Amino acid sequence: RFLKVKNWETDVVLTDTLHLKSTLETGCTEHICMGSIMLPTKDQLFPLAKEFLDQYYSSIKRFGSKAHMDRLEEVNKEIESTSTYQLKDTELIYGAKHAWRNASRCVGRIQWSKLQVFDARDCTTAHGMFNYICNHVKYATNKGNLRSAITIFPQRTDGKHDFRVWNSQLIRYAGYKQPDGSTLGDPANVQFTEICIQQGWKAPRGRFDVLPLLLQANGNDPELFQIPPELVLEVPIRHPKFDWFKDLGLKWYGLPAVSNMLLEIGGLEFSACPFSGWYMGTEIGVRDYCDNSRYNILEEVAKKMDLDMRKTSSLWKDQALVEINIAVLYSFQSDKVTIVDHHSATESFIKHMENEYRCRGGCPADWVWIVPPMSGSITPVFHQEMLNYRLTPSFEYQPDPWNTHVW
Cβ pair 268, 155 in contact under 8 A: yes
x/- letters, 323..362, toward ligand H4B (CB under 6 A): ----------------------------------------
Mark the segment that binds ligand HEM (CB under 6 A) among 106-114, 172-180, 196-204, 356-364.
106-114
397 belongs to the binding site for ligand H4B (CB under 6 A) = no
283 is catalytic: yes
Name, in order, each residue with C-beta under 8 angstroms of 317's C-beta and a sequence gap of 6 or more: 298, 302
From 91, 283, 323, 356, active-site residue: 283
In the complex, the smallest distance separating the C-beta of residue 329 from ligand H4B, rounded to whole angstroms, is 17
Distance CA 366, CA 382 (A): 11
Cβ pair 282, 288 in contact under 8 A: no
From 106, 196, 273, 290, active-site residue: 106
Q: Which of 385, 398, 400, 402: binder of ligand H4B (CB under 6 A)?
A: 385
- Nearest CA among 168, 219, 216, 209 for reference residue 192: 168
Q: Are strands 149-152 and 275-276 parallel, antiparallel or unpaired?
A: antiparallel
Distance CA 17, CA 3 (A): 7
Q: Are strands 257-258 and 275-276 parallel, antiparallel or unpaired?
A: antiparallel
166 is catalytic: no
Residues 75-114, buried b or exposed e (16+ Cβ, 10 A)?
bbeebeeeebbebeeebbbbbbbbbbbbbbebbbbbbbee
| Radius of gyration of the chain, Cα coordinates, nearest whole angstrom | 22
Distance CA 268, CA 347 (A): 34
Which of 267/277 has CB closer to ligand JI1? 277
Name, in order, each residue with C-beta under 8 angstroms of 382's C-beta and a sequence gap of 6 or more: 371, 376
278 is catalytic: yes
x/- letters, 150..189, toward ligand HEM (CB under 6 A): x---------------------------------------
Name, in order, each residue with C-beta under 8 angstroms of 94's C-beta and a sequence gap of 6 or more: 56, 59
Q: Which of 33, 60, 315, 378: binder of Zn ion (CB under 5 A)?
A: 33
36 is in an annotated binding site: yes
In the complex, the smallest distance separating the C-beta of residue 372 from ligand H4B, rounded to whole angstroms, is 8
From 278, 294, 356, 363, active-site residue: 278
Q: Which does 280 bind (CB under 5 to 8 A by kind): ligand H4B, ligand JI1, Zn ion, none?
A: ligand JI1
Q: Which of 107, 165, 286, 290: binder of ligand HEM (CB under 6 A)?
A: 107
Q: Which does 388 bind (CB under 5 to 8 A by kind): ligand H4B, Zn ion, a second copy, none?
A: a second copy
Instruction: Examine residue 401 and say whether the peptide bond preceding it is cis (omega within 30 degrees of 0).
Output: no
DSSP letters for 295-354: T--HHHHHHHHT---S-GGG-HHHHHHHHHHHHHHHHHHHTT--EE-HHHHHHHHHHHHH
Give the DSSP letter of residue 401: G
Q: Which does 367 bind (CB under 5 to 8 A by kind): Zn ion, ligand HEM, a second copy, none?
A: a second copy
In the complex, the smallest distance separating the C-beta of residue 382 from a second copy, rounded to whole angstroms, is 7
Return the sign of the alpha-carbon dihedral for residues 107, 208, 232, 167: negative
| Axis-axis angle for helices 298-305, 316-334 (nearest 10) | 100
Q: Which does 279 bind (CB under 5 to 8 A by kind): Zn ion, ligand JI1, a second copy, none?
A: ligand JI1
Which of 95/256 has CB closer to ligand JI1? 256
290 is catalytic: no
Q: Which of 28, 37, 60, 69: binder of Zn ion (CB under 5 A)?
A: 28
35 belongs to the binding site for Zn ion (CB under 5 A) = yes
* Residues near ligand HEM (CB under 6 A): 100, 103, 105-108, 111, 115, 148, 150, 258, 275, 277-278, 280, 283, 340, 345, 369, 395
Q: Give catalytic residue positions.
A: 106, 109, 278, 283
Residues at the binding site are 36, 106, 169, 278-279, 283, 368-369, 382, 397
* Residues near Zn ion (CB under 5 A): 28, 33, 35
